[PDB]
Ligand binder design. Sequence first.
Ligand SMILES: NC(=O)c1ccc[n+]([C@@H]2O[C@H](COP(=O)([O-])OP(=O)(O)OC[C@H]3O[C@@H](n4cnc5c(N)ncnc54)[C@H](OP(=O)(O)O)[C@@H]3O)[C@@H](O)[C@H]2O)c1
Ligand SMILES: Nc1nc(=O)c2nc(CNc3ccc(C(=O)N[C@@H](CCC(=O)O)C(=O)O)cc3)cnc2[nH]1
Ligand SMILES: [Mn+2]
Ligand SMILES: [Mn+2]
Ligand SMILES: [Mn+2]
Length: 159
Amino acid sequence: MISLIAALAVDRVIGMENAMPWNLPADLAWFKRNTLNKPVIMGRHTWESIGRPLPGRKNIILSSQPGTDDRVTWVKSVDEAIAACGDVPEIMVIGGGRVYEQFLPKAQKLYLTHIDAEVEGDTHFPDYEPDDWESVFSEFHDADAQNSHSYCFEILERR
Ligand SMILES: NC(=O)c1ccc[n+]([C@@H]2O[C@H](COP(=O)([O-])OP(=O)(O)OC[C@H]3O[C@@H](n4cnc5c(N)ncnc54)[C@H](OP(=O)(O)O)[C@@H]3O)[C@@H](O)[C@H]2O)c1
Ligand SMILES: Nc1nc(=O)c2nc(CNc3ccc(C(=O)N[C@@H](CCC(=O)O)C(=O)O)cc3)cnc2[nH]1
Ligand SMILES: [Mn+2]
Ligand SMILES: [Mn+2]
Ligand SMILES: [Mn+2]
């Protein structure tokens, strides 16, 4: 099973200048809980944005060019990325925009954080047809001293 996990600001913005400009510790904790002990697939730009391997996960990087770091697994196509995960229950696709586009048609589940923040951005999460997806979990949180925007965690499953 393939799942996508992402955090979206207003208008589905996910990034600006190869970065995420907000800081929401509660959402990073949610990301860690939902990805630990699973393979994670990311594109090369997202790998450069994170800047190090994510511990406790098999890190798989998509790039058309040879890898430059043997602490992670480098693959050259979507099918190779999936194969490199092996026989696991759930593969997590962690972006960025181009990678989410390619994996969305193959995904059964979306883990989305909706952040109440207006961000100039240059990267968006794909338009997804709402009729295709059922919301199975949602949890709203007001802003607090650690998290400067309100946010909603949602899990959607393909109908
Ligand atoms: N808010 C969030 O949840 C979230 C999550 C992830 C990322 N982001 C943000 O998203 C942005 C990065 O997204 P992006 O769309 O620019 O880049 P991306 O999807 O991370 O990376 C694209 C790169 O991945 C490689 N790639 C993708 N598909 C491939 C394929 N089928 N075969 C081979 N290589 C493939 C290519 O690398 P080569 O050029 O080396 O071939 C391509 O240039 C950053 O701003 C980041 O902070 C946000
Ligand atoms: N829900 C969600 N939120 C995000 O911010 C997010 N970000 C990415 C891409 N960027 C990043 C950037 C940093 C870390 C990261 O350092 N994660 C640590 C958390 C511990 C910490 O630094 O606070 C991890 O071990 O997972 C992960 C993804 C992909 N999916 C996401 N999904
Ligand atoms: Mn092929
Ligand atoms: Mn198999
Ligand atoms: Mn806000």
